[PDB]
Amino acid sequence: RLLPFVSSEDPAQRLKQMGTLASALTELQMEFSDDLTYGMAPRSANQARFEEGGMQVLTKEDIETLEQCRAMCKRGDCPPLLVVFDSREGFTVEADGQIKDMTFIAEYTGDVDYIRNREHDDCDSMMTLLLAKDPSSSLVICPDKRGNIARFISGINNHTLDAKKKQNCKCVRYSVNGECRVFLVATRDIAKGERLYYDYNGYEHEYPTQHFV
Amino acid sequence: KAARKSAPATGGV
Numbered sequence: 001r002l003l004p005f006v007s008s009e010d011p012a013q014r015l016k017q018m019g020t021l022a023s024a025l026t027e028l029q030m031e032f033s034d035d036l037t038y039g040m041a042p043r044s045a046n047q048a049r050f051e052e053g054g055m056q057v058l059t060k061e062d063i064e065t066l067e068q069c070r071a072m073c074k075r076g077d078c079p080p081l082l083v084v085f086d087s088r089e090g091f092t093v094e095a096d097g098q099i100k101d102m103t104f105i106a107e108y109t110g111d112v113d114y115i116r117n118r119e120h121d122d123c124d125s126m127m128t129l130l131l132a133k134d135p136s137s138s139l140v141i142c143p144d145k146r147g148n149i150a151r152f153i154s155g156i157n158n159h160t161l162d163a164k165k166k167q168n169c170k171c172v173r174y175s176v177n178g179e180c181r182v183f184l185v186a187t188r189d190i191a192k193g194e195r196l197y198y199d200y201n202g203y204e205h206e207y208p209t210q211h212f213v
Numbered sequence: 214k215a216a217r218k219s220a221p222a223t224g225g226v
């Protein structure tokens with residue numbers, strides 16, 4: 001079962017957290033969007049039944065946790081995360097309070113587009129939404145103009161025998177009311193100050209990670 | 214070539 005995250009109790013701590021995100025979003029000429037935005041690809045193109053060999057369905061209970069988390073972010077109760085710059089990684093995301101195992105961290109957001117319209121895109125943060133048999137139907141999330149914390153989260157080096165030991169969250173795709181949705185979930189208990197890491201190549205192997213720390 | 218991240222659609226968390 002998905003768990004709702006625990007926002008920091010001090011309002012000044014939540015402001016400092018939102019501040020680090022606003023700052024990193026600014027340096028990237030980005031606006032804040034905690035939703036998928038649909039020009040490029042219409043909302044009507046996002047159908048989970050189009051996924052090759054199907055897409056797991058998010059349960060009523062888990063949709064309720066997702067909606068609760070979404071309502072928390074809307075009122076100022078962001079997850080306890082800090083966007084911190086790193087000499088070796090660029091912008092990174094660290095836990096700024098405890099994050100229990102199975103906790104919903106965030107949804108991977110940005111403009112939804114057809115993979116075909118982004119074949120020559122330099123965005124270091126593109127994420128697959130829908131993988132259909134028809135390549136003209138495959139979708140991707142593009143946080144180049146608007147996004148949230150998800151795009152700043154680090155990935156593991158898939159080439160080294162020990163970089164999997166750094167992984168503390170997992171990216172998953174679930175069908176939510178018939179649409180593909182991309183979520184980040186803590187795979188273990190994460191302490192204050194731990195940097196967040198997931199596998200950028202959880203399904204396809206379309207992300208070069210050989211030079212990652 | 215574009216380099217985007219990928220996540221599974223089966224197997225849960």
Ligand SMILES: Nc1ncnc2c1ncn2[C@@H]1O[C@H](CSCC[C@H](N)C(=O)O)[C@@H](O)[C@H]1O
Pocket residue numbers: 088089090091092124125151152153154155156157211212213
């Ligand atoms: N483990 C790691 N080691 C080194 N660089 C990493 C990394 N994980 C992520 N990155 C960097 O982050 C990019 C993915 S997008 C993550 C946000 C980015 N660091 C930013 O400052 O906007 C990668 O292309 C790489 O430049």
